Short mmCIF file of C-alpha atoms in Angstrom, two decimals:
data_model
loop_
_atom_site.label_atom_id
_atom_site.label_comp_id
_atom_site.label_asym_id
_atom_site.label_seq_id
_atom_site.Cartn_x
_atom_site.Cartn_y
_atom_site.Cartn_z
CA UNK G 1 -11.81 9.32 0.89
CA UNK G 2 -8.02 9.28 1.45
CA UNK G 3 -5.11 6.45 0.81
CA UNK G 4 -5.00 4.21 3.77
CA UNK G 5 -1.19 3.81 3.12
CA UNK G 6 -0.99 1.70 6.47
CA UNK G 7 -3.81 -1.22 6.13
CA UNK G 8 -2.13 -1.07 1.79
CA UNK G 9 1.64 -1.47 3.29
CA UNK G 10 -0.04 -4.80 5.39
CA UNK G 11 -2.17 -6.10 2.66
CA UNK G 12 0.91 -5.84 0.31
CA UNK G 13 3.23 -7.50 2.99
CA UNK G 14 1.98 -10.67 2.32
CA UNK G 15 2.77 -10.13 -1.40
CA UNK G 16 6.86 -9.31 -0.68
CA UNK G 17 6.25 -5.71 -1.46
CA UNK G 18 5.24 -2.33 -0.81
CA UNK G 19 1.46 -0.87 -1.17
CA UNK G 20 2.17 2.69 -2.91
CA UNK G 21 -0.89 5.14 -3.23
CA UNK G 22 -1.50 6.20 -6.73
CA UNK G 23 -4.32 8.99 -7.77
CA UNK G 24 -5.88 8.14 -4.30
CA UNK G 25 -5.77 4.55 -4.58
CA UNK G 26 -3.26 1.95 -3.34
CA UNK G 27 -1.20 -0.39 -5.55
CA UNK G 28 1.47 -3.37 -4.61
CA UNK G 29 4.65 -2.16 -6.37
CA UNK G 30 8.70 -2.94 -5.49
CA UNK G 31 11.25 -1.08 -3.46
#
């Protein structure tokens, strides 16, 4: 299945950052 970039970019909200997909897979990483 595909990168949810949307439901990664909320879950990494409440980290301070953005939720970047990576080989098909999301990851919390800085602006």
């Amino acid at each position: 299945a595909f990168c949810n970039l949307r439901r990664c970019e909320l879950s990494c909200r409440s980290l301070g950052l953005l939720g970047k997909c990576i080989g098909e897979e999301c990851a919390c990483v800085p602006y």
